[PDB]
């Protein structure tokens, strides 16, 4: 009984991911988000341990929702005749990182460092859980404004993580790496690192660096805002044209620009209240 277990509120957003409503769990007034996905519009399907055929998104969310982390957790899900319904955490108050950057402009590097660090820890958690997000971008990151915590959303273009080549891609083209543009092939970790370079530039410059294929493959990063030399180096490293030239997650987090990160509560108190 989904209609008699959650109170359904206003529409929060819609798009390629589906339609998402604000909601409240009747059992305990817990704020939730209710995401509807049309069966007829589902690209990749998966299978649960029960054998039931569910969208890949549900499989991936179950794999990463164990415990606490910087991923929005799947609390429950339901199957309907023509759709699946997902019950997700809802931070309140919340703003997605795309809107946050639109309103604030380029972020101070101390704030970008804290946000970027938290995204790295969240992506590490996904990979440790066998999950590749494949659509890391500011639009798919929520900010819990009171806690200063970032949360990954929209695993609908993701995949099980593997070490062999990927030849399919459903994420955002302007965050996708040049080997995808040129050859329609990529490996998961180095492609993730590329999208993280795009995201970090986005944070410290106020918008993404590339809009067209020729810029993505061209391999030149122009900085439109004042950005420290250490931060420029990290970005350009993540945006290396050759995938094997890109840093690992460990090399990113050991980079000099990443040291002395703020705690999330400090981030909220200094930058978000």
């Amino acid at each position: 009984p989904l209609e008699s277990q959650y109170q359904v509120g206003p529409l929060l957003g819609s798009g390629g991911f589906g339609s998402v409503y604000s909601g409240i769990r009747v059992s305990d007034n817990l704020p939730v988000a209710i995401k509807h996905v049309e069966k007829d519009r589902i690209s990749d399907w998966g299978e649960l341990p029960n054998g039931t055929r569910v969208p890949m998104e549900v499989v991936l969310l179950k794999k990463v929702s164990s415990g606490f982390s910087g991923v929005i957790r799947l609390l429950d899900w339901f199957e309907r005749p023509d759709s699946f319904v997902l019950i997700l955490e809802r931070p309140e108050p919340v703003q997605d990182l795309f809107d946050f950057i639109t309103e604030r402009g380029a972020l101070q590097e101390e704030l970008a460092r804290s946000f970027f660090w938290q995204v790295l820890e969240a992506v590490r958690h996904c990979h440790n859980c066998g999950v590749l997000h494949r659509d890391i971008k500011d639009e798919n990151i929520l900010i819990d404004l009171n806690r200063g915590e970032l949360k990954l959303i929209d695993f609908g273009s993701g995949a099980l993580l593997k070490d062999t080549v990927y030849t399919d891609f459903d994420g955002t083209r302007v965050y996708s790496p040049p080997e995808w543009i040129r050859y329609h092939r990529y490996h998961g970790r180095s492609a993730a690192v590329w999208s993280l370079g795009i995201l970090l530039y986005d944070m410290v410059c106020g918008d993404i660096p590339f809009e067209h294929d020729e810029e993505i493959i061209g391999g030149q990063v122009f900085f439109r805002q004042r950005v420290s030399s250490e931060c420029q180096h990290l970005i350009r490293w993540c945006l290396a044209l050759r995938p094997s030239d890109r840093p690992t997650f460990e090399e990113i987090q050991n980079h000099p620009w990443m040291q002395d990160v703020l705690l999330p509560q400090e981030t909220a108190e200094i930058h978000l209240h």
């Binding site: 798009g15 390629g16 639109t102 639009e139 929209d154 273009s157 994420g171 955002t172 083209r173 302007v174």
Partner: peptide
């Protein structure tokens, strides 16, 4: 101008 980019 700054804009969102749909997925897919």
């Amino acid at each position: 101008k700054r804009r969102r980019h749909p997925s897919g």
